[PDB]
Every structure is written in structure tokens, then in C-alpha cells.
């Protein structure tokens, strides 16, 4: 006669319980088996919360009893109306006697604020052809509400997913100097689309979106947290708007020296800390996320945490071994390419390299031997940076070269830098090779030469490998998924855990990170040209090239070989990011390969899923629309396509992102190791800075790289980005153990979990293998743990999250 239920919810403040009783909250069950005259599932009576059930977290459970006779058949969904003033976070409904589970995880605002009453489905999984008849209209009804109208300013409670270009970064109403090009919607500046906010145009420019205090994301994209400290995405906003101006004020008032004077001054940051004015300390202390980034004395002194790279040797970062090793085991281990001819060539139109083969020490190999056995590699930033060097060098306190670095794979399997080329624009409106050296002024020039390269690499890492390739590239898929795949859909259930916190971090990023005068523009080399440079690189972005084996082959760091376990042979055998990544990759591929056939028996089934098709069509034609005409997009007409798309998406969102994200502070916490900017070119002979370079190599280095003030800001932001929130959900985990009722998916997913821990043991053995020390640890003695699946919270240099979450 009466079905027992239990509602779990969290009050807003966790992210009096009695106030939830009475006629505060009403649920109505919806039948999956018995329909009305129009074929829509029958709806029960308004049923209110009866009492508190006497779990974890800030969660509360409430009892409820539904009238449900045999005429009403089986419940498969429900309506909920919040009559209270304040929104709550709904976790679940559980119906007793099998038991019926509804995983909701959704904010529920006052009923008046919704156009349609909120609906939640049971945890059963269906492709469109398999939805219970009485749930067909409800399902498609919930999708259309999710897509919205494409108009209006989006409000806090809206759950409306739609696309727009990156036209909200510039702030021309404040200043024409803060105008930025629209990125997206043209061939000049192609770019992935982001989540629409509809704030409308600025006064001076109808193409640019006006500023807002809050950058909207659909409501359930903005996760709250039990612990305020875990809202790491918030830290970027407070950094830019509150902390940064406090730092700058500390420098105006002579309270700390404007520049670092020795390397020790930099080591002091994590040691004794830095002395700052009173009001500067009292500013950062109350900030819930920022306060976790430093230690304090209460009144004057702030200290950063000791970066992993310096934890054993404080100077090992300076070695050529470490410089080279970080290209395959560092923060940015995915840019190095095979070089299959000498000298290296450009794809521009003037630009060929001036490095000579004869000048290189290849450990006794000839150049022909090196090329023959594929032992020559390159970090090539020449073509990427040349088109921008003139403009960049026109900025103030910014000077860079377009750099190439030649690498030789030694017999022992380590990388050896053998040349750096530093090029300036050869258009007469205005180009040297540096060889390695251990001693003399030669060694100092080489060291500065290395610094310029890593300035090149830092920018490319932050903006391309990291920002563009993960955050930016992923958002359109998120949007398309909510727009077109029902919460019921198997592929929605597969992919959406890998979108956790993505649109959220990205919105706060557009607001404070990659905006005009934001963190990146005021700390990194290209300044106002930063974001647009990622647009130039997006022109060459290929979705299928993001698949790891494709990536490795494309870069000539691996060849295709069927005889090998993963079907590719590494040309650099102990390439830690690549060797470890292939395990994770393989681990993800098996899971997708097992999950997909559970729901699609043949190619037709993929072709015939109207949701999947509209999804992939919109993701490509709208979401990555500036590239919609490229021939490499998968057609999504077969089983094999579906598997590939899903696998690639899961790869980018979890492992790819983790490998390029969580080494930011561990390697870059020492600014000399990873400078984010260079301020002057090489000193010419007969100049005062030349003598300084002769007489004080440390000062010469510090005067070249990121200034002390922007270092403080840049050190703070990568520290935020490098931390694991205590409520992260890692690869091989789901936030709820009943994410689907399908026992085959559950079991398959559990096998995925087991394989990941097996792999972790394998990586532990790799790190502990003494013969692999050279690449896995190097002179910094820093075990390559960035692709360990598991981690605890904090700055761990390990752990693979499901999604791009920070």
C-alpha cells in the first residue's frame, strides 16, 4: 500500500533540520511501466518529508511514504518541489523493497524559480531505443530544458548548457588597452567554444561580453564542498583580485627588495620565508584557500612550501641531465620530437637552423649514426614563437628568443642536451647557437641559454599543453554531453564523471586566469598575447592526435609495432611519461572496450542512437566548430568509432591532464628551474651587464628571468593548481557506488579499479628499479609519480583525477 523511502540531502550551509518537515518539500513518484492517455508515465500524489532518520558528511536522511498501488506499477523517476526559501543539495532517493535507487546530486531551488518541475530518474541505464515508453517524453523533455533558448543572461539556478566564443576576456569598457581579440568564430582566431553566459555586450564593443561579478556555470557544475579549503578553484579569483594587489602594495612601500639578489634569496622563500607588511599578512590569513598555500608567523613572515625538485639537492636543477630529463619526465613531458635530418628545418616562410653537425658532441656517434639509430631529438619552439617574438619584445620588461634545443639519446638511455639555438626575427625592421659548457663565462651563457628555452617551454606548457589541450579542448564535450545525452544514457554515465569541476574551474579561469591583466598575462612572458598564441596553436589541434599512441608516433618518439604490448615501440625506452602513460591508456582502453558492447551490439546500434549522433554532431560542428571541416574527425557510425571517441575523451580529462598539471609546483616552485618569463636578451660584450654576467652569474640569471613580484604571484597560482582537494574523485572511482543498476557495468568497472592498482604497483617497481634511476629520478632524485593513479590530498606529485578539476 505504502512504499518506504529515504531522502538524503545537504542543507546549503554544509556546502534546523525540522524546517525541512511539514509542507516544505514534496516528492511525486513517476511510473516507468504504467502510462496515462498520452503514454506518459503516471504521477503519484504530492508526498512530503515525514521525519529525520537517526551516512557521513553534512548529510541528513528523511523518511517518506508513498501511496503506490498496483495501478501505478513500477517507479522509475520522480518530481521534487522545494517550497522552502533556500536551495538544498539533493543526494538521493532510496525506495525499499529489488530496492530502487535514485542518484541525484543536484541543487534544488525554490519551486517558483523553475519553469519545469525538477525531475530525477532511477539509476537504470538505457540507450534511446531502450527507454521505458512512459519515460520517453520525460527524457527528451529534460534534454530540451537543458539546452535552453540560446538567449538571455544565465542565472545562478539555471541548468542551461550552451556555447559561446571567448569574447569575455578583454575589458575594453575599462580601458581600450584591455581590449583582446575574440578567440573563436573565425579562421584568424579559431578556438574551442566555452559555456555561454549571456551577460550581453560591453558599451564600447558589441562583440565583447560585459564583465560580471560571477561567471555563470550551469548550477550542478558548481560543486560545493564540505570543507571550504577544498574549493581550490576559488583561490584563483582571490589571488588576482585580493592577494596580488596586496603583494604589489608591499613592493611600492619599499617593504621588501624589488628584485632577488642571489639564488639564496629564492631558497629563503621556502626556508625562513619572506618579510611582508602587516596589512599584507592580515589580508591573506582569512582567505580559506589562499591560507593553505603558506605558513605564517602571524604578523610579517610568509613561507612557501619546499618544492619537490629541491628536496634532495638544492642545485641539481642546474645540471644538463635534469634540464634534459624534465622534457620526458617533467611538468611538460609531451613536446619533444624526433629529429630525422640535420640541420633542423622550419615550416615558416622567411628560417633554417644554423646549428652545425660538426659542433655537436654525440658521445662519439657520428651525425649519420645518430640519425640512423634515431637518437637525435629536439625541443622545437622556433616556428611557434617566431611569429610573436617581435611583438613580445616590443612589450616592456619582456625579451625572448624563438628557441630550438637539440637532444641526443645517450647509450645509457638518458637525454643529453647538445645545442640550443636562439633566434630573433630576420625582417630588417630590427640568431645564435649556444653549446654546452661546464666552466667559464661559456657555462653562464649556456645556463642563460637554458633559461630562455624553459621560458619558451613554460609558456607553451601553461597555455598549450595544459590550458588549450585540456581545459579548453574538453569544455565543448561537457556542454554537448549535457545537451544531448540523457542522464539515463550509458555514454553520459561513462563520460560525465570525467567532466567533474571542469566548466567551473574554466569559468573562474576566464574571470581571473586568462583574462586581460589576469594572472597569466601579468606573470608569463607573452603578456597580452598569451591567450591568442594558444589560438594559433589550436589551428593545428587534431582530436585523434590526442590519443597517446597517435601522439607518440606523430612526434617521432615511438614507431607503430604490433609485436609490442601496446602496439608501439618507444624510441626512448625509459621515457617515463610515455612508458607510464601507455599503461594508463591501455587500462582505460580495456574498460571502454568492455563497457560499450554492453549497450551496443553492432555498428547499426551506434548509427541508430539519435542521442549519440546529435551529441557528436553538435560537439564537432558547434563545440569545436572552427575545425568542423577537418577530415580527421571520427564519423561515429561504428562501434570502433564510439570506443575511440570515448577513450580519447577519458584520456585527456584524466591522465593527460594529471601528468601536465600536478608537476607545476613540484618542478616550478623554484623559479630558476621553470622561469615563466625572460626580461632581457643575452648581454653583448663591452656592456655593464656583460661584466655582471662574468662577475655574478646568479644576479645575471635572476635579472634575466621572472621578476621577484610576479614570481610571488606565479608561485602562488601553480601551488593552488598543484593541490588535490580532499574530496577529489580519482580514476577508477565513482562518487556513488550505485551510479548504475547494471550489474555488468558495475563488475566491469570494478575490474578497471583493480587493474589501476596493479599498474600502480608496477610504477612503484619502475621507480625503485636502480637501472632506471637516470630518467625516473635523475639528479634531483625525484621519483616520477605523476601517473600513479592514487593519491591523498594536498601537494602530492601523484594521483590521477577523473576530470580536469583544477
Identify whether the C-beta of residue 197 lies closer than 8 Å to the C-beta of residue 514. no
Joined grid coordinates for residue 370: 645518430
Residue 722: CB minimum distance to Fe ion, A = 9
Least separation in angstroms between CB 660 and Fe ion: 8
> Which one of the listed residues 382, 471, 484, 566 is annotated catalytic?
471
Catalytic residue chosen out of the listed positions 171, 661, 775, 802:
661
Specify whether the CB–CB gap between 205 and 195 falls below 8 A. Answer: no
Q: How far is the CB of 620 from Fe ion (least distance, A)?
A: 24
Looking at the Cβ atoms of 47 and 661, the one nearer to Fe ion is: 661
Q: C-beta of 796: minimal distance to Fe ion in Å?
A: 15
Which residue's CB is nearer to Fe ion, number 159 or number 657?
A: 657
* Structure-block grid coordinates of residue 441: 663565462
> CB-wise, 240 or 661, nearer to Fe ion?
661
Quick count: other Cβ atoms within 10 Å of Cβ 806?
24
Contact (Cβ atoms closer than 8 angstroms) between residue 14 and residue 88: no
Name the β-bridge partners of 101. Answer: 94
Length of the chain: 806
Q: Comparing C-alpha atoms, which of 511, 497, 499, 494 is closest to residue 471?
A: 499
Minimal distance, residue 335 CB to Fe ion, in Å: 17
Minimum distance, C-beta of residue 806 to Fe ion, in the bound complex (Å): 6
Tell me the sheet residues that pair with 420: 405, 434
- Interface characters, 622-661, with Fe ion (x: CB under 5 A): ---------------------------------------x
Q: Among residues 108, 102, 137, 95, which one has the least CA distance to residue 121? A: 102
For Fe ion, the closer of residues 167 and 661 by Cβ is 661
Give residue number: closest CB to Fe ion: 661
Tell me how far apart the alpha carbons of residues 373 and 571 are, in angstroms, rounded to a whole number. 9
- Residue 571 or residue 806: which is nearer to Fe ion going by CB? 806
- Residue 469 as a binder of Fe ion (CB under 5 A): the answer is no
Cα separation, 201 vs 378, in Å, equals 45
Residues 86 and 111: beta-carbon distance below 8 Å? no
In the complex, the smallest distance separating the C-beta of residue 505 from Fe ion, rounded to whole angstroms, is 7
Q: Is 466 annotated in some ligand binding site? A: yes
**754 exposed, middle or buried (CB, 10 Å; 0-12, 13-18, 19+)?**
exposed
Give the residue with the Cβ less far from Fe ion, 26 or 661: 661
Using the CB atoms, write b or e for 62-91: b if 16+ within 10 Å. Answer: bebebebeeebbbbbbbbbbbebeebbbbb
C-alpha–C-alpha distance, residues 222 and 467, integer Å = 20
Interface of this chain with Fe ion, residues 658 to 697, rule: CB under 5 A: 661
595 SS3 class: helix
Minimum CB–partner distance for residue 238 and Fe ion (Å)? 18
Cis peptide bond N-terminal to 343, omega within 30: yes
Distance from C-alpha of 802 to C-alpha of 799, rounded to nearest angstrom: 10
Enumerate residues preceding breaks in the chain (C to N > 2.5 Å).
15, 54, 97, 350, 430
Cell of 663: 608537476
Q: Whose Cβ is closer to Fe ion: residue 692's or residue 727's?
A: 727
Q: Between residues 524 and 701, which has the closer beta carbon with respect to Fe ion?
A: 524
Beta strands in 592-643 (DSSP E): none
- Which lies closer to Fe ion via its Cβ, residue 64 or residue 473? 473
Here the cell at position 597 is 558492447
Name residue, grid cell 578539476: 805
Alpha-carbon gap, residue 248 to 425, rounded angstroms: 34
> Is residue 420 a known part of a binding site?
no
The answer on whether 471 is annotated among ligand-binding residues is yes
The number of helices, as runs of H, and strands, as runs of E, in the chain is: 26, 22
Helix axis angle for 743-768 and 576-595, nearest 10°, is 170
Name which of 196 and 461 has its Cβ closer to Fe ion.
461
Least distance in angstroms from the C-beta of 804 to Fe ion: 6
Closest distance of CB 664 from Fe ion, Å: 8
- State the catalytic residue, choosing from 445, 657, 724, 802: 657
Residue 657 annotated as lining a ligand binding site: yes
List CB contacts of 755: < 8 A, sequence separation 6 or more: 587, 590, 591
Q: Rounded to an integer, what distance in angstroms lies between the CA atom of residue 408 and that of residue 601?
A: 49
* CA atoms of 215 and 601, how far apart (whole Å): 42
Quick check: is 657 catalytic? yes
Q: Other C-beta atoms within 10 Å of 54: how many?
A: 6
Interface pattern 345-374 for Fe ion (x via CB under 5 A): ------------------------------
In this structure, how many other beta carbons lie within 10 angstroms of the beta carbon of residue 364? Answer: 7
CA-nearest of 515, 496, 518, 471 to 223 is 496
Q: How far is the CB of 163 from Fe ion (least distance, A)?
A: 21
Contacts of 460 (CB under 8 A, 6+ apart): 332, 335, 381, 384
How many C-beta atoms surround the C-beta of residue 631 within 10 A? 4
* φ, ψ (nearest 5 deg) of residue 753: -55, -50
Q: Which of residues 760-789 bind Fe ion (CB under 5 A)?
A: none
Q: How many residues bind Fe ion (CB under 5 A)?
A: 1
Which CB atom, from 233 or from 644, has the smaller least distance to Fe ion?
233
Let me know the angle formed at the C-alpha of 422 by 417 and 426, rounded to the nearest 5 degrees. 150
With a CB cutoff of 8 Å and minimum separation 6, the contacts of 485 are 491, 492, 495, 611, 612, 615
- If the CB atoms of residues 124 and 471 are measured against Fe ion, the closer one turns out to be 471
38 marked ligand binding residue: no
Closest distance to Fe ion from the beta carbon of 328 (Å): 20
Q: Which of 308, 382, 466, 484 is catalytic?
A: 466
Question: Nearest Cα to 325, choosing from 574, 583, 551?
Answer: 574
Cell of 736: 556513488
Residues that bind Fe ion (CB under 5 A): 661
Binding site as annotated, residues: 466, 471, 657, 661, 806
Binding site as annotated, residues for Fe cation: 466, 471, 657, 661, 806
Active site residues: 466, 471, 657, 661, 806
Amino acid at each position: 500500500h505504502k512504499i518506504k523511502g529515504t531522502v538524503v540531502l545537504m542543507p546549503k550551509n554544509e556546502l534546523n533540520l525540522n524546517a525541512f518537515l511539514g509542507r516544505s518539500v514534496s516528492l511525486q513518484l513517476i511510473s516507468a511501466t504504467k502510462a496515462d492517455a498520452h503514454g506518459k508515465g503516471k504521477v503519484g500524489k504530492d508526498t512530503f518529508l515525514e521525519g529525520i532518520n537517526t551516512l557521513g558528511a553534512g548529510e541528513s536522511a528523511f523518511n517518506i511514504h508513498f501511496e503506490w498501488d498496483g495501478s501505478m506499477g513500477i517507479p522509475g523517476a520522480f518530481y521534487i518541489k522545494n517550497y522552502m526559501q533556500v536551495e538544498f543539495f539533493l543526494k538521493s532517493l532510496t525506495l525499499e523493497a529489488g530496492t530502487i535507487r535514485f542518484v541525484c546530486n543536484s541543487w534544488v531551488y525554490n519551486t517558483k524559480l523553475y519553469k519545469s518541475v525538477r525531475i530525477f530518474f532511477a539509476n537504470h541505464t538505457y540507450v534511446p531505443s531502450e527507454t521505458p515508453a512512459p519515460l520517453v517524453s520525460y527524457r527528451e523533455e529534460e534534454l530540451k530544458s537543458l539546452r535552453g533558448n540560446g538567449t538571455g543572461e544565465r542565472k545562478e539556478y539555471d541548468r542551461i548548457y550552451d556555447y559561446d566564443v571567448y569574447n569575455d576576456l578583454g575589458n575594453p569598457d575599462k580601458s581600450e588597452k584591455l581590449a583582446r581579440p575574440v578567440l573563436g568564430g573565425s579562421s584568424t582566431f579559431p578556438y574551442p567554444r566555452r559555456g555561454r553566459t549571456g551577460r550581453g555586450p560591453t558599451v564600447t564593443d558589441p562583440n565583447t561580453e560585459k564583465q560580471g561579478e560571477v561567471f555563470y556555470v550551469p548550477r550542478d557544475e558548481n560543486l560545493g564542498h564540505l570543507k571550504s579549503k577544498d574549493a581550490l578553484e576559488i583561490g584563483t579569483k582571490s589571488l588576482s583580485q585580493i592577494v596580488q594587489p596586496a603583494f604589489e602594495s608591499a613592493f611600492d612601500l619599499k617593504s621588501t627588495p624589488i628584485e632577488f639578489h642571489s639564488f639564496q634569496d629564492v631558497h629563503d622563500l621556502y626556508e625562513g620565508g619572506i618579510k611582508l607588511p602587516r596589512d599584507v599578512i592580515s589580508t591573506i590569513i582569512p582567505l580559506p584557500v589562499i591560507k593553505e598555500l603558506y605558513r605564517t608567523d602571524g604578523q610579517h613572515i610568509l613561507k612557501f612550501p619546499q618544492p619537490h625538485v629541491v628536496q634532495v639537492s638544492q642545485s641539481a636543477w642546474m645540471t644538463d641531465e635534469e634540464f634534459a630529463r624534465e622534457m620526458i619526465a617533467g611538468v611538460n613531458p609531451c613536446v619533444i620530437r624526433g629529429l630525422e635530418e640535420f640541420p633542423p628545418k622550419s615550416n615558416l616562410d622567411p628560417q633554417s637552423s644554423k646549428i652545425t653537425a660538426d659542433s655537436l658532441d654525440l658521445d662519439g656517434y657520428t651525425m649519420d649514426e645518430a640519425l640512423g639509430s634515431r637518437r637525435l631529438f629536439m625541443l622545437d619552439y622556433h616556428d611557434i614563437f617566431m611569429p610573436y617574438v617581435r611583438q613580445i619584445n616590443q612589450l616592456n620588461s619582456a625579451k625572448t628568443y624563438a628557441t630550438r634545443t637539440i637532444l641526443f639519446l645517450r647509450e645509457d638511455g638518458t637525454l643529453k642536451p647538445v645545442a640550443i639555438e636562439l633566434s630573433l626575427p630576420h625582417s630588417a625592421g630590427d640568431s645564435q647557437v649556444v653549446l654546452p659548457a661546464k666552466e667559464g663565462v661559456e657555462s653562464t651563457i649556456w645556463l642563460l641559454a637554458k633559461a630562455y628555452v624553459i621560458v619558451n617551454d613554460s609558456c607553451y606548457h601553461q597555455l598549450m599543453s595544459h590550458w588549450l589541450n585540456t581545459h579548453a579542448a574538453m569544455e565543448p564535450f561537457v556542454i554537448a554531453t549535457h545537451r544531448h545525452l540523457s542522464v539515463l544514457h550509458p555514454i553520459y554515465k561513462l563520460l560525465t564523471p570525467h567532466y567533474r569541476n571542469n566548466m567551473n574551474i574554466n569559468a573562474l579561469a576566464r574571470q581571473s586566469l586568462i583574462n586581460a591583466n589576469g594572472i597569466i598575462e601579468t606573470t608569463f612572458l607573452p603578456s597580452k598575447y598569451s591567450v591568442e598564441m594558444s589560438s594559433a596553436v589550436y589551428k593545428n589541434w587534431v582530436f585523434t592526435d590526442q590519443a597517446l599512441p597517435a601522439d607518440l608516433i606523430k612526434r617521432g618518439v615511438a614507431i607503430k609495432d604490433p609485436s609490442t604490448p601496446h602496439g608501439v615501440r618507444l624510441l626512448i625506452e625509459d621515457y617515463p611519461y610515455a612508458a607510464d602513460g601507455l599503461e594508463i591508456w591501455a587500462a582505460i582502453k580495456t574498460w571502454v572496450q568492455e563497457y560499450v558492447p554492453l549497450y551496443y551490439a553492432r555498428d547499426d546500434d551506434v548509427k541508430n542512437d539519435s542521442e549519440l549522433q546529435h551529441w557528436w554532431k553538435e560537439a564537432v560542428e558547434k563545440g569545436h566548430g572552427d575545425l568542423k571541416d577537418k577530415p580527421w574527425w571520427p564519423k561515429l557510425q561504428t562501434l570502433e568509432d564510439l570506443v575511440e571517441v570515448c577513450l580519447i575523451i577519458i584520456w585527456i580529462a584524466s591522465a593527460l591532464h594529471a601528468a601536465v598539471n600536478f608537476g607545476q609546483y613540484p618542478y616550478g616552485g623554484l623559479i630558476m628551474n621553470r622561469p615563466t618569463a625572460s626580461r632581457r636578451l643575452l648581454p653583448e660584450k663591452g656592456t655593464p651587464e656583460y661584466e655582471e654576467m662574468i662577475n655574478n652569474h646568479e644576479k645575471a640569471y635572476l635579472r634575466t628571468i621572472t621578476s621577484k613580484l610576479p614570481t610571488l604571484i606565479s608561485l602562488s597560482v601553480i601551488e593552488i593548481l598543484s593541490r588535490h582537494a580532499s574530496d577529489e574523485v580519482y580514476l577508477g572511482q565513482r562518487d556513488n557506488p550505485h551510479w548504475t543498476s547494471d550489474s555488468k557495468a558495475l563488475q566491469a568497472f570494478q575490474k578497471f579499479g583493480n587493474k589501476l592498482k596493479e599498474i600502480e604497483e608496477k610504477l612503484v617497481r619502475r621507480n625503485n628499479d636502480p637501472s632506471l634511476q637516470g630518467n625516473r629520478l635523475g639528479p634531483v632524485q625525484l621519483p616520477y609519480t605523476l601517473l600513479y593513479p592514487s593519491s591523498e590530498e594536498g601537494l602530492t606529485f601523484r594521483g590521477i583525477p577523473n576530470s580536469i578539476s583544477i
